[PDB]
Amino acid sequence: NSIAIPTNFTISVTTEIIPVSMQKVSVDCTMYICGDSEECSNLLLQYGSFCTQLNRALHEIAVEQDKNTQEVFAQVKQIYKTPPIKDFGGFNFSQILPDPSKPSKRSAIEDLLFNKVTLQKFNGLTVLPPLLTDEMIAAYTSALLAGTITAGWTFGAGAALQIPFAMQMAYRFNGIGVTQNVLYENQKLIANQFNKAIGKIQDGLSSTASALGKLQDVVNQNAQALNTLVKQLSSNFGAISSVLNDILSRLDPPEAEVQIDRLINGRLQALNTYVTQQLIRAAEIRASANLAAEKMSECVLGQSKRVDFCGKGYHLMSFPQSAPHGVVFLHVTYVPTQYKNFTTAPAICHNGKAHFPREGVFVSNGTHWFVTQRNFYEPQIITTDNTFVSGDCDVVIGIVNNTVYDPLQPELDS
Amino acid sequence: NGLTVLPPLLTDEMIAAYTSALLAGTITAGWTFGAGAALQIPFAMQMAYRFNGIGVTQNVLYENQKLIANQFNKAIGKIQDGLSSTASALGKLQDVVN
Amino acid sequence: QALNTYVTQQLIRAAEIRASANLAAEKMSECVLGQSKRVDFCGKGYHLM
Amino acid sequence: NSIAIPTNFTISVTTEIIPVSMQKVSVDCTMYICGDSEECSNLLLQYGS
Amino acid sequence: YQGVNCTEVPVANVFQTRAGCLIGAEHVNNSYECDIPIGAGICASYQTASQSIIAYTMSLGEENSVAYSN
Ligand SMILES: *[C@@H]1O[C@H](CO)[C@@H](O[C@@H]2O[C@H](CO)[C@@H](O[C@@H]3O[C@H](CO[C@H]4O[C@H](CO)[C@@H](O)[C@H](O)[C@@H]4O)[C@@H](O)[C@H](O[C@H]4O[C@H](CO)[C@@H](O)[C@H](O)[C@@H]4O)[C@@H]3O)[C@H](O)[C@H]2NC(C)=O)[C@H](O)[C@H]1NC(C)=O
Ligand SMILES: *[C@@H]1O[C@H](CO)[C@@H](O[C@@H]2O[C@H](CO)[C@@H](O[C@@H]3O[C@H](CO)[C@@H](O)[C@H](O)[C@@H]3O)[C@H](O)[C@H]2NC(C)=O)[C@H](O)[C@H]1NC(C)=O
Ligand SMILES: *[C@@H]1O[C@H](CO)[C@@H](O[C@@H]2O[C@H](CO)[C@@H](O)[C@H](O)[C@H]2NC(C)=O)[C@H](O)[C@H]1NC(C)=O
Ligand SMILES: *[C@@H]1O[C@H](CO)[C@@H](O[C@@H]2O[C@H](CO)[C@@H](O)[C@H](O)[C@H]2NC(C)=O)[C@H](O)[C@H]1NC(C)=O
Ligand SMILES: *[C@@H]1O[C@H](CO)[C@@H](O[C@@H]2O[C@H](CO)[C@@H](O)[C@H](O)[C@H]2NC(C)=O)[C@H](O)[C@H]1NC(C)=O
Ligand SMILES: *[C@@H]1O[C@H](CO)[C@@H](O)[C@H](O)[C@H]1NC(C)=O
Ligand SMILES: *[C@@H]1O[C@H](CO)[C@@H](O)[C@H](O)[C@H]1NC(C)=O
Ligand SMILES: *[C@@H]1O[C@H](CO)[C@@H](O)[C@H](O)[C@H]1NC(C)=O
Ligand SMILES: *[C@@H]1O[C@H](CO)[C@@H](O)[C@H](O)[C@H]1NC(C)=O
Incomplete structure (x- = not known):
């Protein structure tokens, strides 16, 4: 028969990291397989059109990367400029807005994020x-x-x-069911808490350098794949040697062609495996980019009602920040605190009628019964304006004897 | 030989x-x-x-509580019986295993 | 060659399973811990719990 | 100028099943391809990684 | 020619960009939208006078100046 209603709240700001893009790679099949050897090229010509398919797949991946970036970012038609005023009602945005004096137009948080990931193989392999x-x-x-x-x-x-x-x-604040007067009465405290949270985030970013693991994983995976592809050249696959010139200058054509064919088969297999794995990874990255674009649209440009879509708590707003091959979101939420116990009831039994609150719950501290909102303690005297009358005092289970008041009569008889 | 399940x-x-x-x-x-x-x-x-969340006043529940509880219990029992009877309901996981 | 084929098939199946798991986590978060207003996302009709 | 308004309702409960996880598998390449024969392993040593 | 500087391209109207060296393009220092992407923020188009290349830096949109009252 009891209920707890918060008498305090707090402002929390949390971070989210989502990878978006991927490094673009172009590979020349002929140079990798039979580099600077025209006889090897003639032998490879018997295999048809193997290289063109891989080139086309890599080109499609490269185009898809730019498409992902354009979909994620280019959503605003025009360019707004930084407001010359700083009268934001006590809120601080200096650490997020760009610095007019810096050579590069990043912010402090963006600079820290870029510095956090500061940590040849050209053989026919190119990066665009x-x-x-x-x-x-x-x-x-x-x-x-x-x-x-x-x-x-x-x-x-x-x-x-x-x-x-x-x-x-x-x-x-009206979005989450809290009356607007709370902000107008605690503006200074809310602004101070917001500034403190921003400072704490900045300190946490400046302290540890292991917070960008999601992007570091993508970078490391791409680097390792390219390393394996490069290291595959030293194998001989059972042939005499791994150098075409040695085979040419050591053996006669009728079996040198066999050795060259063996090497060609091995290198073709390696290239095919690399291309397939790159395709799968690109599909995963595209899914992540679609999620990032959806989050941008549903969080930056509006307030979301989906639970745990914008961090824990009731969503208020969020701000985006750039990152290498990704984005960073700063979600600002609302968290109630300092719960106090109370005694409640489902209805109020008047002289033959039952009363239900319009919006809120019936609470009491032992003697007086009030009607208040659900996520903040703010009692009001029970009145015929606050309630809604329907039925009698028979069917409701747990109804409570009390009196509903009306201020119209004291003015009428005065 | 080479295959193992962790x-x-x-x-x-x-x-x-x-x-x-x-x-x-x-x-x-x-x-x-x-x-x-x-x-x-x-x-x-x-x-x-x-109930208020879907645009229905609370009086409706506060007056039909007993019937609502009976309907909920009956639905739970029907689900239990249906699960106990038919053996072809978990094909979504059976397909992955297969 | 047989080993390579098996590994590739397993990778694709893993991608599908990961997508399904993400959907399951979203459903848990948006339905068990709150009331959803998206139509037909949490059953057929008006959602209660 | 005609409308229809319900005067009664019902409570329904349904079911939804979502797979989450696969089966973990580990494979030893050398044992599978060239098991117990050292000549086969020596030949396989030239194939890379 | 991607990824090379044209100090050595005649071996195998010139203008050096961040994606290589472009041959047959007329450099301009205005800004328009992208019709044909090139790379590194450079985009090309056909506008007249004969219909020739113009190579220009990309533009992100038009400025909007919202007044400031509290
Ligand atoms: C909330 O908003 C207010 C404004 O409304 C901000 O107030 C000023 O903010 C600026 C920028 O954050 C502060 O300037 C910085 O002060 C740091 C410490 O200053 C003390 O110590 C230095 C010793 O070097 C003394 O010279 C100085 O007089 C102070 O005694 C400096 O270390 C900073 O320098 C670094 O940043 C600048 C860019 O700003 C670089 O050019 C430098 O090279 C260097 O890297 C910087 O000068 C200023 O002190 C604040 N003043 C007041 C009265 O608050 C709040 O900072 C802002 N708060 C939050 C949390 O956003
Ligand atoms: C909405 O529809 C439902 C089902 O059609 C109605 O439920 C029915 O309610 C009546 C009275 O409210 C029940 O009659 C009672 O039955 C019990 C047990 O048989 C008996 O002991 C009583 O004396 C009385 O006759 C009826 O059984 C019940 N239907 C079923 C299947 O149990 C409901 O009343 C409807 N709502 C409204 C507002 O009309
Ligand atoms: C919630 O609790 C905080 C305690 O941190 C209250 O902050 C106090 O506010 C009063 C007046 O508003 C000040 O005199 C105190 O100095 C504040 N204390 C601290 C530690 O800052 C806050 O007022 C509480 N919320 C409400 C609505 O009363
Ligand atoms: C307080 O509760 C009592 C129930 O015990 C109510 O008493 C009944 O009141 C009705 C009319 O209001 C009478 O017809 C009954 O005969 C009363 N029963 C008894 C046992 O006294 C009483 O009305 C309630 N008071 C208020 C203000 O709601
Ligand atoms: C293209 O490559 C050539 C390679 O020789 C560059 O020529 C020199 O580049 C270095 C730095 O890359 C400069 O310090 C030298 O001054 C350049 N040589 C001369 C004679 O000026 C050339 O600069 C490169 N092109 C661009 C645009 O960087
Ligand atoms: C507060 O009320 C709860 C019942 O909801 C009770 O268990 C607890 O002891 C109460 N605490 C105080 C300090 O009254
Ligand atoms: C309950 O709260 C009301 C309003 O604050 C107050 O008038 C009343 O005295 C309180 N009752 C007790 C027992 O403290
Ligand atoms: C709480 O339970 C008691 C019996 O355990 C019951 O008498 C009382 O009515 C219940 N509370 C409400 C609000 O119905
Ligand atoms: C473009 O650059 C040239 C030389 O750098 C200069 O003469 C010309 O005025 C510039 N164009 C414009 C529109 O300023």
């Missing part, structure tokens, strides 16, 4: 640069962040005017 | 314990699952809250 440079990605992220902060709910509506931040916070 | 890290007893803990938490704490709380919210209150 991405279509979008890091500066363009940072510009897109800054434009998104500035536009969101400045506009609020009028972001993608062309002509707009700066909506005050406190109104956006009040709207978000 | 055991899972979590034994099924631990999985059952995790499931039971989740069920008990969601059946006792109600909407205060995760925070301090540590008190039992009445079940009918959670039912009324979720």
Whole structure:
């Protein structure tokens, strides 16, 4: 017959990391298999069109990488600029917005993230640069962040005017079922907690260098695959030697061709295995990129009601940050604290009628009965305006004797 | 010779314990699952809250509680009987094993 | 060659199983611990628990 | 100008099954390919990794 | 020619970019949208005068200046 209602809350900010893109690789099959040997090329010509398929697959992967990046980032039509004012109602955004003085237009957190992953094989193997440079990605992220902060709910509506931040916070508080007056009465404390959480995140990022394991894994896997492909050249696969010139200068054509065929078969198998594994990994990366784009759309541009989709707790807002081959999200949530026990009831039994609250629960400390919201303690005197009348005092199980008051009569008779 | 099967890290007893803990938490704490709380919210209150969640007033549940409980128990019993009768319900996992 | 074929098939099956496990985790989080309003995501009809 | 409004309802319970995990398998390549024969292992040594 | 500098390309209208050296393109220092991607933020298009290449740096969009009132 009891219930606990929070009398305090806190603001928490958490981090999320999602890989997006992958390194682009182009491989020349002929140079890898039968490099600088025209006779080896003539022998390989008997195998038809094996190399073209691998080249086409690698080209498709390379195109898909840029498509993934474009899908994730390029979502805003225009470019907003950093507001020259810093009157955000006490909230601090200096550590996230770009520094006008720095040569590169990153922020402190972005600089730390980029520095956190600072840690030949050209034989026919080449790496192509991405279509979008890091500066363009940072510009897109800054434009998104500035536009969101400045506009609020009028972001993608062309002509707009700066909506005050406190109104956006009040709207978000209304989103989770808390009356807006709480923010207007605890603005300073909320801002202080938010700033402290941001500082704690910055300190944690600056302390440990093992927080970007998700991207480090992708980088290491690609590097190891390329290392294995390179190291495969030294094998002989049962032939006389691993050098074409040795076979040419040591054996007669009729069996030198056999040795060359053996080497060709081995190298073709290695190339095929590498290409297939790259295809599978690219599919996984594409799935991750789709998830990242969905999260961007559903979290940065609006408030989400899905449970545990934006971190633990009731979602308020989130901010994006760039990263090497990935993104970083900073989710800001709401966590109630300091629960206190109370005694409750399902209904109030008046003179023959039953009363149910419009929105809230019936609570009492032993003598007085109040109606209050569910995620914050704020009692009010029970009134005929707060309730809703239906039925009698017979069917409800656990109904409680009390009195419902009306302020209309004291004004009517005065 | 070369083929070997390694055991899972979590034994099924631990999985059952995790499931039971989740069920008990969601059946006792109600909407205060995760925070301090540590008190039992009445079940009918959670039912009324979720009834309101789909645009139905709470009086409906508070007046039909007995019928609602009977229907829920009957549905649970029917599911148990159906599981005990038909042997071709877990094909989704049977296919993976096969 | 037989070993290579088996390994590739196992890798593809592992990818499918991982996708299914992600779906299961999402369903647990959005249905056991809260009420879902997505239509037909948590049963046929209005969802309760 | 006609509408239909229900005057009664029912409570239904359904079932949903989702696979989560596969079976872990480990394979020894040398034993499978060239088991117990050292000549076969010596020949396999030239094939790489 | 990808990944090489044209100080040695005549062996096998010039302009050196971050993706190689481009032959037959007219360099401009304006900014437009991308019609044909090249790499490293460089994009090419056909606009007239005869219809010739123009090689330009990519543009991310148009600026929006929202006024500032609290
Ligand atoms: C909330 O918002 C307020 C503004 O409304 C910020 O207030 C100022 O913020 C700036 C930038 O964070 C602070 O400047 C930094 O101060 C550091 C410490 O300063 C003390 O120690 C130095 C010794 O070197 C003294 O010279 C100085 O007078 C202070 O006594 C410096 O170490 C920083 O230098 C580093 O950053 C700058 C870029 O800002 C680089 O150019 C430098 O090379 C160096 O890398 C920097 O100068 C400033 O002190 C704050 N003032 C006040 C009154 O608060 C809050 O910082 C902000 N809080 C959060 C959490 O965001
Ligand atoms: C909505 O529909 C259901 C099912 O059609 C209705 O349930 C039925 O309710 C009536 C009275 O509420 C039950 O009659 C009673 O039956 C018991 C046991 O037989 C008997 O002891 C009583 O004297 C009385 O006759 C009826 O049995 C029950 N149906 C079933 C299958 O059990 C329900 O009433 C409907 N709701 C409304 C608001 O009409
Ligand atoms: C929640 O608890 C905190 C304690 O950390 C309260 O913060 C105190 O607030 C009062 C007035 O608002 C100040 O005089 C104290 O100095 C604060 N204490 C600390 C440690 O900062 C906060 O007020 C509580 N929330 C509510 C709504 O009362
Ligand atoms: C307090 O509860 C008692 C139940 O014991 C109510 O008493 C009944 O009241 C009705 C009309 O209000 C009478 O017809 C019954 O005869 C009463 N029964 C008894 C045993 O006294 C009482 O009305 C309730 N008071 C309030 C303010 O709700
Ligand atoms: C393309 O490669 C050639 C290789 O010789 C570069 O020529 C020299 O490059 C180094 C640094 O890469 C400079 O310090 C030298 O001054 C260059 N030589 C001369 C004579 O200037 C050439 O610079 C490269 N192209 C670009 C755009 O970097
Ligand atoms: C608070 O109420 C709970 C019942 O919900 C009870 O178990 C506990 O002892 C109470 N604590 C105090 C300090 O009254
Ligand atoms: C219960 O709370 C109300 C409102 O704060 C107060 O008037 C009343 O005295 C309290 N009862 C007790 C027993 O403290
Ligand atoms: C709590 O349980 C007691 C008996 O254990 C019962 O009398 C009481 O009515 C219950 N509480 C409510 C609110 O019904
Ligand atoms: C482009 O660069 C040239 C030389 O660097 C300069 O003369 C010209 O004015 C520039 N174009 C524009 C539009 O400024």
